[PDB]
Amino acid sequence: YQQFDNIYLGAEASVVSCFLQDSEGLIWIGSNKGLFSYDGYSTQQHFTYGENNNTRIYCGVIIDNTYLYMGTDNGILVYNYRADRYEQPETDFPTDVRTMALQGDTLWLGALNGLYTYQLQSRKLTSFDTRRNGLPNNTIYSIIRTKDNQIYVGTYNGLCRYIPSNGKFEGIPLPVHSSQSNLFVNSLLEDTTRQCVWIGTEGYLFQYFPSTGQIKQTEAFHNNSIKSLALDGNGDLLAGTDNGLYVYHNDTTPLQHIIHDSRNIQSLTNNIIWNIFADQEHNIWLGTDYGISLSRYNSLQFIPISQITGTGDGNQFYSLFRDSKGFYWFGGANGLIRFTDPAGERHDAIWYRMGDKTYPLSHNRIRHIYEDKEQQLWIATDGSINRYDYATRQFIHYNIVDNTYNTNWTYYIFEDTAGQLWISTCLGGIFVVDKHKLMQSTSGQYIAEQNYSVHNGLSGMFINQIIPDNEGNVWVLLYNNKGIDKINPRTREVTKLFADELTGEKSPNYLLCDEDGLLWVGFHGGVMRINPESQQSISFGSNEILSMTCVKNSIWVSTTNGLWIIDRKTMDARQQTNKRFTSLLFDPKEDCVYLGGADGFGISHSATYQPERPILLTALYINNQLVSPRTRDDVPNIRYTNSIKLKYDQNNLSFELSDLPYSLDEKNKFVYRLEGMDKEWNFLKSNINRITYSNLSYGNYQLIISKLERDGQPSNRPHILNIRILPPWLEHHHHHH
Amino acid sequence: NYQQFDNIYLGAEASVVSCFLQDSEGLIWIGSNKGLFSYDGYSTQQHFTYGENNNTRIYCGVIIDNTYLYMGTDNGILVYNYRADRYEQPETDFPTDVRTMALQGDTLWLGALNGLYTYQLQSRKLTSFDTRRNGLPNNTIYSIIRTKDNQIYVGTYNGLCRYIPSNGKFEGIPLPVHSSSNLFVNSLLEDTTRQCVWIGTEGYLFQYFPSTGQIKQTEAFHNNSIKSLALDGNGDLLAGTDNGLYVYHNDTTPLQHIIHDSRNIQSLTNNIIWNIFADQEHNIWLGTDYGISLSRYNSLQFIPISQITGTGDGNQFYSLFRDSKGFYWFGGANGLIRFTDPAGERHDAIWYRMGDKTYPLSHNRIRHIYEDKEQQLWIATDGSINRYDYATRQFIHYNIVDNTGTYNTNWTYYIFEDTAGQLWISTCLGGIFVVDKHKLMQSTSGQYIAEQNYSVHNGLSGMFINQIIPDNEGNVWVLLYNNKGIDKINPRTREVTKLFADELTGEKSPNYLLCDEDGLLWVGFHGGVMRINPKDESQQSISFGSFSNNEILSMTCVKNSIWVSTTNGLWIIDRKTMDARQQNTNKRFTSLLFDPKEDCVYLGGADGFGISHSNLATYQPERPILLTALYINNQLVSPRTRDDVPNIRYTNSIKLKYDQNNLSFELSDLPYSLDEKNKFVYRLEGMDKEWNFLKSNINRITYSNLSYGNYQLIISKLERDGQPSNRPHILNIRILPPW
């Protein structure tokens, strides 16, 4: 909170009382002169000088995913942000609305002269008062609904909570202070982690615990007023006051106190913080008595399973894989998910699981996913091995035994250069098997060509990974054992190596081959590089290894604690949130890395990975004047338009674009072109998001805008606007309403 | 209520029950002093053999990977694959004398008589926690739980502590007592509604509140110990002791205390309660020192939307409708949901809303759903009217204005089709529009001009119209918002008359309108209804209940009654006498639908809907039939005891030898929650020509002397009409020839 990006709406509209973010990410601003929006580049107004909508906004709520309800001196402005029109219902709203809170489909309204509910379907307006309902006072400043569906109402003289059964209100007994002749309750905030409601009053910050009724005084800010409360991305409590911002973490950590410095343009813009809003990306918006301070939240992007197929089922990911046809395969404890596009919208994921009607698996617990020499997809599971059939979209199951030990608990699979499948197990040792004959087999159970076991050379039969050498040798990772077994399949010679070094606590639990033929062995606090019989080790100092994968010249090592990145040639080690990741995948083509964990996965670069954001048109200008449905009947809301038809003399057009870059230090770069006029891409400077065209002839055009990709190439998913300029004779075809 | 139980006793001299599990398909499993059992609602079945290592006392269990029962024993952990019906031991050397188990993601916590352990299910790593290395108060562990916020609580021989994953140690939590030795902590239970952890010990029941560190001595029961804890469907805390069951509601409410009564075979079976388990249907299972006491749950059956769905999105339901093709259409404040079964078992809901990339709607606020004369589905919304296209699964939106171009159809409240191809559309602000249905459907204009409009200028009483309803007398009756009386339109002359304004006025201003099957009109107002006969324009009126100012939310015809949902509850009114009767739940329903096919009523409300029979017990959802036992020559057979037989519960196809031809099958639909059992019919294709009937107490099906060949056993619930259902259970049977 050391630096802020400060934002101003003009000299008239210096006071900001609230923020809303619509479900598509655009930020809305309630100022002392009316509503604005801010697209990350410039502000826009949505009122006309002189009109009833040119007025102080005190609060707002989004209704029906298409209306902004805003509290005003005169009642409630209802702004339809999709149509871009004020759409007043017939309702006689109470004047002076200062606070609002949705409960199901009833909107609670807190005003200077009363408390109300507004049922949204029937338009039924119900009033609540001191004399009938036992409210402590009629002037309302703050109303919230908690997760367990209780209503808290802060007033000019005290805090209470609604009692649905009898329609009355129960006081919460905040302390009465000799310095005050009434008990202002300015702000209320539910905190689900701390299990409290935070209460801001003049001079005192309280936590109310509904579990016990305890009212804890957490802070006293002498002679200061608490105006607003939010929780940031770390879950710290942010308190906006008349003397800057306070940040609370816990009882033993001192508050941060953040204030305006008149000689420093990057400081909090003003000390009087009327409102604080945490946006969908955890950016903190501070609304003040003089403009806005934005504090950007920065990074790894983490993606919950439910965003891929939702479905709120969980999964702990132990294997992540991308096939040569480009499907993602993410599995572990609870099944396998096939999907496309990790950081897109579409995904069309399929979940293969035990007991599914449509997509079954012999067992939920996936241990390995592998693509063979003929691009056939193999999985290892605790219900044996399976092979995918892409045409049927279903798995084919194989039972395997040796010539006498079996394959039910399979750990690892690979294909050798003679068309044999190598399979490691949790009891039956290692099986080696004719791939085509297994595939061609028709016997449900299948006798193995070969098997390695403790009877013929292995140390134990509890073995995880098996990895081929460049010179045909098979290196086996041994469970609860010392050293690593090594197999020459040419003369069946198994030998136990590095028992000297990899014993006791140096017991190995992970093993991989890099692109240069070097093995990396992970053990308790340290990794060790090998030439298959040379090389040695290193350690993590002041515990254990979950996953390792190669990333270029680096090997990434996921641990209980966090990540270690090692350079492959020197063996230099460097440590990098506190998430533990049980799975790692490097995607060379997209040049990112997937980090698989509990009920989700992260994505990061091989510099903080940026999620893909669609491109919006935020403003249309005709002959140099901004135009929208709010002011013109003959022009649509450009944000929600794919094709526009214009009159013949509406041929001087400007466009503003944005991908809503609120979180970003540096803006993305863009390219544009107008099909029907331009023959190539035009490049924009990153600070310029305006596109302009003059004196267009009649006919059809396509405006095409793309984000420049970080390799320099325009994206192939542009935003496209169809534009027809009508001749004089066809004028009556112009946009209308 | 806890005053009567269904008492269940186990075979094989087992009499002590120490735990219950319920698999993801609803079967109950029972750990007993002699080994593992299952119960299908008809009989108990053992899953162990006398003398074998599986014939052993079970102390606790959890289900792992949707296929195993991990169970604690003297020898460690007994692992049972319930799908394969085989004991399947891991290679892992487990500690002995396990007493408690709790999952944390993909790690299983194990508490034992001499240590605490972790077991990581992927790596199979076993990690030990102790007194010296970790600050445990004692190595004897009796209870372990994981809370929703992912904390680990461990109850021991000497007190309670909490895991610290920072440093891998345990923080003690001191328990305030009257004096002293070591405080046994036998039992732990998280309660998200009170936001505490309940703690049962010898002598006391505590609540600990992690948000503040407060610790409350909620009960003190000298010479009694708390052995088990659960919460019931009401959110009451149930405490199992060695002197019966205690039920806690709040501090001001007397505890209920429930004990055995030797003179009454429906009382609690035994006073020593080892485990209490609340099943998915909220039935309470009590495992005691002698048998099981089952307490069936009584409600209204309420279905939350997420059960439909599979998402946490809300909706307040204002229109329920089921179409001529059988699709249900439940819509309200937050869009419109299409789905085919009220229990959501087929996960095939489609949810239409504004903003949805795949299934958009012009507006989320649905005001009416209607099917026309040609089976086309129409909806009225605050974004005009739409028609469904079944083939594309998309709505088609229409914009309609009057001929002057002044009024439009943006805010549509109600729609119907008359007998002459015309759609009648009621609006807020634009009056009523009458539109030629086929011309609208075929229009390509993007604005349609209505043939007719009714408004304040040509006879209407106002411009805000809620509902418009045809007579059986050729008229259209019109409910206006906050007006006096109701308007009557004669569509042929276009005459508009205002009727019943003498009574329906001021506090009796109407706000609901409907026509019943006999063609009488029902008008709803604050705290009463009025029945109108449109033949003679006669009228009778009643008031019901209190208060006088008591709002009507929804009204619907249910056979010979009308159902009326209000702010203060549900009233049922007889259509001929007009006798009003109040019903009793606290939920308030803003939508109602009678389905004559299923003989039931849907009551739509906040984030879900109730289902009820028309004639009042409670309503039971259809459950699938399972096969739970196979007998050959009158001996029970399973993969556990034979090579050549599969798990009957998970097989669609069985292959038998020539001399395995005397067969019995037990069946169940898991009727745990039922006073009366259902009735079944069965037939064996290849043998039977007709259905056979069971008799409700009998769930066993027997065929003798089958000849080699192919058969198919079909089993079906006998429906309330006396028809078989169309969810039969099918088993293909092949009997092989001798050779």
PDB file of N, CA and C in Angstrom, chain A residues 441-505:
ATOM      1  N   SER A 441      -5.510 -58.161 -28.152  1.00  0.00           N
ATOM      2  CA  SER A 441      -6.012 -59.229 -27.294  1.00  0.00           C
ATOM      3  C   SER A 441      -7.500 -59.108 -27.021  1.00  0.00           C
ATOM      4  N   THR A 442      -8.067 -60.238 -26.655  1.00  0.00           N
ATOM      5  CA  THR A 442      -9.486 -60.481 -26.750  1.00  0.00           C
ATOM      6  C   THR A 442      -9.819 -61.450 -25.622  1.00  0.00           C
ATOM      7  N   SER A 443      -9.007 -61.375 -24.580  1.00  0.00           N
ATOM      8  CA  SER A 443      -8.993 -62.392 -23.567  1.00  0.00           C
ATOM      9  C   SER A 443      -9.237 -61.780 -22.184  1.00  0.00           C
ATOM     10  N   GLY A 444      -9.618 -60.504 -22.145  1.00  0.00           N
ATOM     11  CA  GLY A 444      -9.954 -59.827 -20.888  1.00  0.00           C
ATOM     12  C   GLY A 444      -8.825 -59.800 -19.862  1.00  0.00           C
ATOM     13  N   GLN A 445      -8.280 -60.984 -19.567  1.00  0.00           N
ATOM     14  CA  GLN A 445      -7.011 -61.108 -18.853  1.00  0.00           C
ATOM     15  C   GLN A 445      -5.881 -61.405 -19.853  1.00  0.00           C
ATOM     16  N   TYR A 446      -4.654 -60.995 -19.532  1.00  0.00           N
ATOM     17  CA  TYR A 446      -3.535 -61.178 -20.461  1.00  0.00           C
ATOM     18  C   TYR A 446      -2.202 -61.594 -19.805  1.00  0.00           C
ATOM     19  N   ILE A 447      -1.691 -62.767 -20.187  1.00  0.00           N
ATOM     20  CA  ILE A 447      -0.405 -63.250 -19.663  1.00  0.00           C
ATOM     21  C   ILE A 447       0.758 -62.429 -20.236  1.00  0.00           C
ATOM     22  N   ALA A 448       1.650 -61.974 -19.358  1.00  0.00           N
ATOM     23  CA  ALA A 448       2.785 -61.135 -19.749  1.00  0.00           C
ATOM     24  C   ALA A 448       3.982 -61.887 -20.344  1.00  0.00           C
ATOM     25  N   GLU A 449       4.491 -61.333 -21.442  1.00  0.00           N
ATOM     26  CA  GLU A 449       5.780 -61.662 -22.050  1.00  0.00           C
ATOM     27  C   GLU A 449       6.900 -61.815 -21.024  1.00  0.00           C
ATOM     28  N   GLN A 450       6.993 -60.826 -20.140  1.00  0.00           N
ATOM     29  CA  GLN A 450       8.043 -60.733 -19.143  1.00  0.00           C
ATOM     30  C   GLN A 450       7.504 -60.104 -17.870  1.00  0.00           C
ATOM     31  N   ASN A 451       8.222 -60.365 -16.776  1.00  0.00           N
ATOM     32  CA  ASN A 451       8.091 -59.636 -15.515  1.00  0.00           C
ATOM     33  C   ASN A 451       9.394 -59.643 -14.714  1.00  0.00           C
ATOM     34  N   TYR A 452       9.753 -58.486 -14.163  1.00  0.00           N
ATOM     35  CA  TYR A 452      10.806 -58.414 -13.157  1.00  0.00           C
ATOM     36  C   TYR A 452      10.208 -58.420 -11.770  1.00  0.00           C
ATOM     37  N   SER A 453      10.781 -59.220 -10.878  1.00  0.00           N
ATOM     38  CA  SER A 453      10.323 -59.290  -9.490  1.00  0.00           C
ATOM     39  C   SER A 453      11.485 -59.523  -8.521  1.00  0.00           C
ATOM     40  N   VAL A 454      11.173 -59.468  -7.226  1.00  0.00           N
ATOM     41  CA  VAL A 454      12.132 -59.770  -6.157  1.00  0.00           C
ATOM     42  C   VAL A 454      12.730 -61.187  -6.309  1.00  0.00           C
ATOM     43  N   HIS A 455      11.979 -62.088  -6.956  1.00  0.00           N
ATOM     44  CA  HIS A 455      12.431 -63.470  -7.247  1.00  0.00           C
ATOM     45  C   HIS A 455      13.553 -63.518  -8.283  1.00  0.00           C
ATOM     46  N   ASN A 456      13.652 -62.481  -9.114  1.00  0.00           N
ATOM     47  CA  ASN A 456      14.688 -62.435 -10.156  1.00  0.00           C
ATOM     48  C   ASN A 456      15.469 -61.120 -10.312  1.00  0.00           C
ATOM     49  N   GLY A 457      15.637 -60.365  -9.226  1.00  0.00           N
ATOM     50  CA  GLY A 457      16.580 -59.239  -9.256  1.00  0.00           C
ATOM     51  C   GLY A 457      16.208 -57.900  -8.639  1.00  0.00           C
ATOM     52  N   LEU A 458      14.919 -57.574  -8.597  1.00  0.00           N
ATOM     53  CA  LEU A 458      14.500 -56.348  -7.913  1.00  0.00           C
ATOM     54  C   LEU A 458      14.752 -56.455  -6.408  1.00  0.00           C
ATOM     55  N   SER A 459      14.933 -55.305  -5.752  1.00  0.00           N
ATOM     56  CA  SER A 459      15.134 -55.225  -4.285  1.00  0.00           C
ATOM     57  C   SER A 459      13.823 -55.354  -3.487  1.00  0.00           C
ATOM     58  N   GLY A 460      12.817 -54.578  -3.876  1.00  0.00           N
ATOM     59  CA  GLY A 460      11.459 -54.760  -3.393  1.00  0.00           C
ATOM     60  C   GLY A 460      10.542 -54.817  -4.587  1.00  0.00           C
ATOM     61  N   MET A 461       9.239 -54.948  -4.334  1.00  0.00           N
ATOM     62  CA  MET A 461       8.222 -54.986  -5.407  1.00  0.00           C
ATOM     63  C   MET A 461       7.335 -53.734  -5.390  1.00  0.00           C
ATOM     64  N   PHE A 462       7.622 -52.874  -4.421  1.00  0.00           N
ATOM     65  CA  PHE A 462       6.960 -51.599  -4.202  1.00  0.00           C
ATOM     66  C   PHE A 462       7.732 -50.528  -4.980  1.00  0.00           C
ATOM     67  N   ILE A 463       7.408 -50.377  -6.256  1.00  0.00           N
ATOM     68  CA  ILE A 463       8.152 -49.463  -7.122  1.00  0.00           C
ATOM     69  C   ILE A 463       7.279 -48.467  -7.905  1.00  0.00           C
ATOM     70  N   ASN A 464       7.764 -47.239  -7.975  1.00  0.00           N
ATOM     71  CA  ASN A 464       7.003 -46.158  -8.539  1.00  0.00           C
ATOM     72  C   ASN A 464       7.459 -45.965  -9.974  1.00  0.00           C
ATOM     73  N   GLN A 465       8.363 -45.035 -10.211  1.00  0.00           N
ATOM     74  CA  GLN A 465       8.649 -44.633 -11.560  1.00  0.00           C
ATOM     75  C   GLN A 465       9.654 -45.545 -12.212  1.00  0.00           C
ATOM     76  N   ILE A 466       9.456 -45.810 -13.504  1.00  0.00           N
ATOM     77  CA  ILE A 466      10.456 -46.483 -14.339  1.00  0.00           C
ATOM     78  C   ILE A 466      10.730 -45.662 -15.588  1.00  0.00           C
ATOM     79  N   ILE A 467      12.016 -45.402 -15.825  1.00  0.00           N
ATOM     80  CA  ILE A 467      12.465 -44.427 -16.804  1.00  0.00           C
ATOM     81  C   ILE A 467      13.525 -44.991 -17.729  1.00  0.00           C
ATOM     82  N   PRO A 468      13.284 -44.857 -19.023  1.00  0.00           N
ATOM     83  CA  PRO A 468      14.319 -45.355 -19.894  1.00  0.00           C
ATOM     84  C   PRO A 468      15.513 -44.414 -20.016  1.00  0.00           C
ATOM     85  N   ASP A 469      16.700 -45.021 -20.065  1.00  0.00           N
ATOM     86  CA  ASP A 469      17.976 -44.447 -20.526  1.00  0.00           C
ATOM     87  C   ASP A 469      18.008 -44.131 -22.004  1.00  0.00           C
ATOM     88  N   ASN A 470      19.029 -43.368 -22.400  1.00  0.00           N
ATOM     89  CA  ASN A 470      19.341 -43.167 -23.816  1.00  0.00           C
ATOM     90  C   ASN A 470      19.957 -44.398 -24.425  1.00  0.00           C
ATOM     91  N   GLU A 471      20.639 -45.179 -23.595  1.00  0.00           N
ATOM     92  CA  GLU A 471      21.193 -46.455 -24.021  1.00  0.00           C
ATOM     93  C   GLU A 471      20.353 -47.626 -23.495  1.00  0.00           C
ATOM     94  N   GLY A 472      19.037 -47.540 -23.672  1.00  0.00           N
ATOM     95  CA  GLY A 472      18.128 -48.655 -23.374  1.00  0.00           C
ATOM     96  C   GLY A 472      17.932 -49.164 -21.943  1.00  0.00           C
ATOM     97  N   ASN A 473      18.689 -48.647 -20.965  1.00  0.00           N
ATOM     98  CA  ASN A 473      18.554 -49.099 -19.569  1.00  0.00           C
ATOM     99  C   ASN A 473      17.321 -48.555 -18.841  1.00  0.00           C
ATOM    100  N   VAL A 474      16.739 -49.367 -17.962  1.00  0.00           N
ATOM    101  CA  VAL A 474      15.547 -48.967 -17.232  1.00  0.00           C
ATOM    102  C   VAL A 474      15.863 -48.740 -15.750  1.00  0.00           C
ATOM    103  N   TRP A 475      15.654 -47.497 -15.326  1.00  0.00           N
ATOM    104  CA  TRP A 475      16.026 -47.050 -14.006  1.00  0.00           C
ATOM    105  C   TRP A 475      14.805 -47.007 -13.123  1.00  0.00           C
ATOM    106  N   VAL A 476      14.856 -47.746 -12.029  1.00  0.00           N
ATOM    107  CA  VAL A 476      13.677 -47.923 -11.215  1.00  0.00           C
ATOM    108  C   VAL A 476      13.766 -47.174  -9.895  1.00  0.00           C
ATOM    109  N   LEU A 477      12.711 -46.417  -9.581  1.00  0.00           N
ATOM    110  CA  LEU A 477      12.609 -45.716  -8.303  1.00  0.00           C
ATOM    111  C   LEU A 477      11.981 -46.656  -7.297  1.00  0.00           C
ATOM    112  N   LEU A 478      12.741 -46.918  -6.232  1.00  0.00           N
ATOM    113  CA  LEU A 478      12.334 -47.818  -5.163  1.00  0.00           C
ATOM    114  C   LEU A 478      11.755 -47.178  -3.912  1.00  0.00           C
ATOM    115  N   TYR A 479      10.621 -47.730  -3.540  1.00  0.00           N
ATOM    116  CA  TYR A 479       9.859 -47.317  -2.391  1.00  0.00           C
ATOM    117  C   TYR A 479      10.459 -47.914  -1.074  1.00  0.00           C
ATOM    118  N   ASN A 480      10.789 -47.053  -0.112  1.00  0.00           N
ATOM    119  CA  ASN A 480      11.269 -47.474   1.231  1.00  0.00           C
ATOM    120  C   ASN A 480      12.489 -48.382   1.133  1.00  0.00           C
ATOM    121  N   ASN A 481      13.470 -47.879   0.403  1.00  0.00           N
ATOM    122  CA  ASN A 481      14.595 -48.655  -0.037  1.00  0.00           C
ATOM    123  C   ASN A 481      15.828 -47.752  -0.123  1.00  0.00           C
ATOM    124  N   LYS A 482      16.990 -48.364  -0.340  1.00  0.00           N
ATOM    125  CA  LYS A 482      18.234 -47.633  -0.517  1.00  0.00           C
ATOM    126  C   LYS A 482      18.817 -47.807  -1.925  1.00  0.00           C
ATOM    127  N   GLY A 483      19.255 -46.703  -2.516  1.00  0.00           N
ATOM    128  CA  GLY A 483      19.713 -46.711  -3.899  1.00  0.00           C
ATOM    129  C   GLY A 483      18.596 -46.884  -4.913  1.00  0.00           C
ATOM    130  N   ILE A 484      18.984 -47.131  -6.155  1.00  0.00           N
ATOM    131  CA  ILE A 484      18.052 -47.303  -7.264  1.00  0.00           C
ATOM    132  C   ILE A 484      18.470 -48.480  -8.140  1.00  0.00           C
ATOM    133  N   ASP A 485      17.510 -49.352  -8.452  1.00  0.00           N
ATOM    134  CA  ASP A 485      17.732 -50.499  -9.341  1.00  0.00           C
ATOM    135  C   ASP A 485      17.891 -50.059 -10.808  1.00  0.00           C
ATOM    136  N   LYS A 486      18.657 -50.829 -11.579  1.00  0.00           N
ATOM    137  CA  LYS A 486      18.950 -50.506 -12.974  1.00  0.00           C
ATOM    138  C   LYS A 486      18.967 -51.779 -13.819  1.00  0.00           C
ATOM    139  N   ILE A 487      18.257 -51.739 -14.943  1.00  0.00           N
ATOM    140  CA  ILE A 487      17.997 -52.928 -15.749  1.00  0.00           C
ATOM    141  C   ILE A 487      18.538 -52.803 -17.168  1.00  0.00           C
ATOM    142  N   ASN A 488      19.304 -53.812 -17.581  1.00  0.00           N
ATOM    143  CA  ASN A 488      19.657 -54.019 -18.967  1.00  0.00           C
ATOM    144  C   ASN A 488      18.688 -55.055 -19.529  1.00  0.00           C
ATOM    145  N   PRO A 489      17.700 -54.610 -20.331  1.00  0.00           N
ATOM    146  CA  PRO A 489      16.693 -55.513 -20.912  1.00  0.00           C
ATOM    147  C   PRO A 489      17.281 -56.475 -21.961  1.00  0.00           C
ATOM    148  N   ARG A 490      18.520 -56.213 -22.366  1.00  0.00           N
ATOM    149  CA  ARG A 490      19.202 -57.025 -23.357  1.00  0.00           C
ATOM    150  C   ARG A 490      19.706 -58.346 -22.768  1.00  0.00           C
ATOM    151  N   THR A 491      20.137 -58.328 -21.502  1.00  0.00           N
ATOM    152  CA  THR A 491      20.558 -59.554 -20.794  1.00  0.00           C
ATOM    153  C   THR A 491      19.921 -59.661 -19.401  1.00  0.00           C
ATOM    154  N   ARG A 492      18.824 -58.925 -19.212  1.00  0.00           N
ATOM    155  CA  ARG A 492      17.994 -58.968 -17.999  1.00  0.00           C
ATOM    156  C   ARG A 492      18.759 -58.686 -16.704  1.00  0.00           C
ATOM    157  N   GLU A 493      19.919 -58.041 -16.821  1.00  0.00           N
ATOM    158  CA  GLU A 493      20.759 -57.709 -15.667  1.00  0.00           C
ATOM    159  C   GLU A 493      20.217 -56.530 -14.855  1.00  0.00           C
ATOM    160  N   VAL A 494      19.772 -56.817 -13.640  1.00  0.00           N
ATOM    161  CA  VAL A 494      19.388 -55.771 -12.705  1.00  0.00           C
ATOM    162  C   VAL A 494      20.546 -55.524 -11.750  1.00  0.00           C
ATOM    163  N   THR A 495      20.867 -54.260 -11.503  1.00  0.00           N
ATOM    164  CA  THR A 495      21.891 -53.927 -10.515  1.00  0.00           C
ATOM    165  C   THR A 495      21.527 -52.742  -9.637  1.00  0.00           C
ATOM    166  N   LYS A 496      21.893 -52.848  -8.365  1.00  0.00           N
ATOM    167  CA  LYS A 496      21.566 -51.842  -7.373  1.00  0.00           C
ATOM    168  C   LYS A 496      22.706 -50.817  -7.240  1.00  0.00           C
ATOM    169  N   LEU A 497      22.434 -49.589  -7.682  1.00  0.00           N
ATOM    170  CA  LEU A 497      23.425 -48.509  -7.648  1.00  0.00           C
ATOM    171  C   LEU A 497      23.090 -47.413  -6.639  1.00  0.00           C
ATOM    172  N   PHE A 498      24.133 -46.710  -6.190  1.00  0.00           N
ATOM    173  CA  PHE A 498      24.015 -45.559  -5.277  1.00  0.00           C
ATOM    174  C   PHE A 498      23.403 -45.867  -3.905  1.00  0.00           C
ATOM    175  N   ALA A 499      23.272 -47.153  -3.575  1.00  0.00           N
ATOM    176  CA  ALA A 499      22.965 -47.564  -2.196  1.00  0.00           C
ATOM    177  C   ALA A 499      23.903 -46.866  -1.199  1.00  0.00           C
ATOM    178  N   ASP A 500      25.152 -46.646  -1.620  1.00  0.00           N
ATOM    179  CA  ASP A 500      26.147 -45.858  -0.873  1.00  0.00           C
ATOM    180  C   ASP A 500      25.617 -44.479  -0.416  1.00  0.00           C
ATOM    181  N   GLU A 501      25.033 -43.739  -1.362  1.00  0.00           N
ATOM    182  CA  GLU A 501      24.704 -42.316  -1.181  1.00  0.00           C
ATOM    183  C   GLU A 501      23.220 -42.056  -0.900  1.00  0.00           C
ATOM    184  N   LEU A 502      22.368 -42.887  -1.487  1.00  0.00           N
ATOM    185  CA  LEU A 502      20.923 -42.701  -1.429  1.00  0.00           C
ATOM    186  C   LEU A 502      20.255 -43.645  -0.442  1.00  0.00           C
ATOM    187  N   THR A 503      20.758 -43.648   0.783  1.00  0.00           N
ATOM    188  CA  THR A 503      20.270 -44.584   1.778  1.00  0.00           C
ATOM    189  C   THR A 503      19.753 -43.828   2.981  1.00  0.00           C
ATOM    190  N   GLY A 504      19.024 -44.524   3.852  1.00  0.00           N
ATOM    191  CA  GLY A 504      18.629 -43.979   5.150  1.00  0.00           C
ATOM    192  C   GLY A 504      17.682 -42.828   4.931  1.00  0.00           C
ATOM    193  N   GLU A 505      18.027 -41.656   5.454  1.00  0.00           N
ATOM    194  CA  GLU A 505      17.213 -40.453   5.241  1.00  0.00           C
ATOM    195  C   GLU A 505      17.335 -39.925   3.810  1.00  0.00           C
TER     196      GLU A 505
END
